[PDB]
Amino acid sequence: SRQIVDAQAVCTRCKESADFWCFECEQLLCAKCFEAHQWFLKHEARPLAE
Amino acid sequence: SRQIVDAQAVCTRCKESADFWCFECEQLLCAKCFEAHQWFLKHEARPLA
Ligand SMILES: [Cl-]
Ligand SMILES: [Zn+2]
Ligand SMILES: [Zn+2]
Ligand SMILES: [Zn+2]
Ligand SMILES: [Zn+2]
């Protein structure tokens, strides 16, 4: 399943602009929510292209 | 900006399973492509996990 991520994509948790994609959660995250995700989970994830 | 994301991380070059992200190439690379990357370039990069 590929997915289109719009230019205005937003974090799945808060309202901030998305910066990361998690391959196992399948979700978009802002930097601050992403740092929490990395503390509590060990998932493959990547920065979004700027 | 506008881009496609996949459920699985695969190398941008060869489509094998990916292991690294390069911030300046903005690319996913498998281990073998990334070793080649390091031979030719010096960029900020991280493993995917
Ligand atoms: Cl992707
Ligand atoms: Zn995750
Ligand atoms: Zn967030
Ligand atoms: Zn490759
Ligand atoms: Zn690079």
Numbering used by the authors:
A (entry chain B): 119 to 168
B (entry chain A): 119 to 167
Could you share sentences copied from the article?
In line with the GF/UC analysis above, the structure of B1-box was determined to 2.0 Å resolution, unveiling an unexpected oligomerization in PML. In comparison, the residues 128–167, coordinated by two Zn ions, fold into a compact global domain, termed subdomain 2 (SD2). The subdomain 2 is a typical B-box-type Zn finger fold with a conserved β1–β2–α1–β3 arrangement and Zn-binding residues. In W157-dimer, the inter-molecular engagement is mainly mediated by two sets of hydrophobic interactions between W157 and F152/F138. In SD1-dimer, the N-terminal I122 and V123 residues could undergo a loop-to-strand transition to seal two B1s together via β-strand augmentation. The intermittent engagement between W157- and F158-interfaces enables the formation of a “brick”-like tetramer.
The ProMyelocyticLeukemia (PML) protein, also known as TRIM19, is the core component of PML nuclear bodies (NBs) that are tightly associated with nuclear matrix. Previous studies have shown that the integrity of RBCC domain is essential for PML NB formation. In this study, we also report a previously unrecognized B1-box polymerization (n > 4) that is essential for PML/TRIM19 nuclear body assembly.
